[PDB]
């Protein structure tokens, strides 16, 4: 529930491996480069950034957010973070055919199949799929996500977020 603090190191160009987005007058993590300092401190897609070096992010554009990181003084950048405020978890059961009951494309749920476990469990469309049974699927291709779902046993537990 509460915000955690993270401390990251810059590279030479002053980067941490992070793209940010403006949403409802907050700032959110949109992309996290592999093997970056951002990645190492556990920042993910959907995390809200409340502060960068004690300075409030409220009302900032993403262009302003990035500028503040690039021009930050010293070797360490501190951020105050709220872990994915929008994330929910849904558990479904595959039926006889081995399906839970939804259509997806580009990591977003686009349709709920009638009277499937996804239907019973109130899975919503226009929602990105973040994790499936522990496995993060952000930045993966649809085929890798469909294969994760295939070799899954019966219980399929996904975390989702509204696309926003």
């Amino acid at each position: 529930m509460d915000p955690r603090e993270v401390i990251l190191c810059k590279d030479q160009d002053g980067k941490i491996g992070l793209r940010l987005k403006s949403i409802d007058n907050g700032i959110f993590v949109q992309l996290v480069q592999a093997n970056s300092p951002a990645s190492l401190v556990g920042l993910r897609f959907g995390d809200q950034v409340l502060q960068i070096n004690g300075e409030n992010c409220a009302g900032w554009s993403s262009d302003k957010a990035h500028k503040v990181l690039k021009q930050a003084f010293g070797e360490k950048i501190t951020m105050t973070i709220r872990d994915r405020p929008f994330e929910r978890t849904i558990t479904m059961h595959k039926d006889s055919t081995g399906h839970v009951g939804f259509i997806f494309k580009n990591g977003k749920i686009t349709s709920i199949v009638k009277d499937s476990s996804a239907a019973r469990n109130g899975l919503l469309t226009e929602h990105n799929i973040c994790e499936i049974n522990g496995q993060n699927v952000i930045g993966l291709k649809d085929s890798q996500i469909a294969d994760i779902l295939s070799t899954s046993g019966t219980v399929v537990t996904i975390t989702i977020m509204p696309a926003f």
Partner: peptide
């Protein structure tokens, strides 16, 4: 493409 799953 899509993936019914």
């Amino acid at each position: 493409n899509e993936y019914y799953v």
